[PDB]
Design a protein around this ligand. Structure first.
Ligand SMILES: *[C@@H]1O[C@H](CO)[C@@H](O)[C@H](O)[C@H]1NC(C)=O
Ligand SMILES: *[C@@H]1O[C@H](CO)[C@@H](O)[C@H](O)[C@H]1NC(C)=O
Ligand SMILES: *[C@@H]1O[C@H](CO)[C@@H](O)[C@H](O)[C@H]1NC(C)=O
Length: 280
């Protein structure tokens, strides 16, 4: 929790909806009556609905760090950082400053960023003052050979374009190079290893079948044979102002297939899944 979403139709659209949002790519996850957007929810919700660990798509903001050989750099480490940023979720990483002669007071800052990137600093000073969530790193009472730590937190407001920026301690030539990359795309299972997926009449895209022309259904199971995909839906809805199969079933090649329940003695029946029995 929490995931706010509206009629999401792809894994990326789900990820973009907020850091609490995750996407279930499980084949047939959306049973009768359930639209594609049910695939997008908080991790605990999907788990509870039977989405397995390998089927929850949930890329996360993260930092990778690299240090050059030695000399290299002396005072700031690490020398290279790569961030993968999911919108709304901070990536955190630590920069160490090691005084050599100067200076007693040390500030940490970065070059101007686009409005899409928010950066704050925690300062873990040795004197031992602590600052948190500040626009700049700031430590007084810095001493030679006793390293100080700054925690850098970077948040993107969108799926950003790959860019770089630098972090520097004021008065020093040292550079921390920060590579910034988006983390918005899902790594989903494609249909390469099974020609029967989506009945071999559509493309599998993070659990959703995108059916070839002349085929409809969650699994592309229904050939239309030019009966319009409308005519077909018409025998699944009671009136033009009503919803298909009462919101409780799928229109499967012109006929409602109703949600089955594990609850005794619940039965959803009728031409449009309109009869909701509690005593069957
Ligand atoms: C998905 O459901 C369809 C029912 O139309 C079925 O043909 C297919 O075997 C199912 N695939 C799974 C569970 O992997
Ligand atoms: C950075 O260092 C601080 C202070 O030692 C520590 O509490 C924090 O967990 C570190 N942050 C990361 C991202 O490793
Ligand atoms: C009937 O209602 C559906 C519901 O969305 C709509 O797509 C369609 O425009 C309507 N058709 C006519 C001709 O009334």
């Amino acid at each position: 929790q929490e995931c706010t979403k509206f009629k999401v139709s792809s894994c990326r659209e789900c990820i973009e909806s907020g850091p609490g949002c995750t996407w279930c790519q499980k084949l047939n996850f959306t049973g009768p009556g359930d639209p594609d957007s049910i695939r997008c929810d908080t991790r605990p919700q999907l788990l509870m609905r039977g989405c397995a660990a390998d089927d929850i798509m949930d890329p996360t903001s993260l930092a990778e760090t690299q240090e050059d050989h030695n000399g290299g750099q002396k005072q700031l480490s690490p020398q290279k950082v790569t961030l993968y940023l999911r919108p709304g979720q901070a990536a955190a990483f630590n920069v160490t400053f090691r005084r050599a002669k100067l200076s007693s007071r040390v500030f940490l800052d970065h070059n101007a960023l686009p409005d899409t990137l928010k950066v704050t600093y925690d300062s873990f000073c040795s004197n031992g003052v602590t600052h948190r969530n500040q626009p700049r790193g700031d430590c007084d009472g810095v001493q030679i050979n006793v390293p100080i730590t700054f925690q850098v937190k970077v948040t993107a407001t969108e799926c950003i374009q790959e860019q770089s920026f630098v972090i520097r301690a004021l008065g020093f030539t040292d550079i921390v190079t920060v590579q910034v990359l988006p983390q918005c795309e899902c790594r989903c299972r494609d249909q390469s290893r099974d020609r029967s997926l989506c009945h071999g009449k559509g493309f599998l895209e993070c659990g959703i079948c995108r059916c070839d022309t002349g085929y409809i259904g969650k699994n592309c199971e229904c050939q239309t044979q030019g009966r319009s995909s409308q005519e077909l839906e018409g025998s699944c809805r009671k009136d033009n102002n009503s919803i298909i199969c009462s919101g409780l079933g799928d229109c499967v090649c012109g006929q409602c297939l109703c949600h089955t329940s594990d609850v005794p003695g619940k039965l959803i029946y009728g031409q449009y899944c309109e009869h909701h029995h509690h005593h069957h």
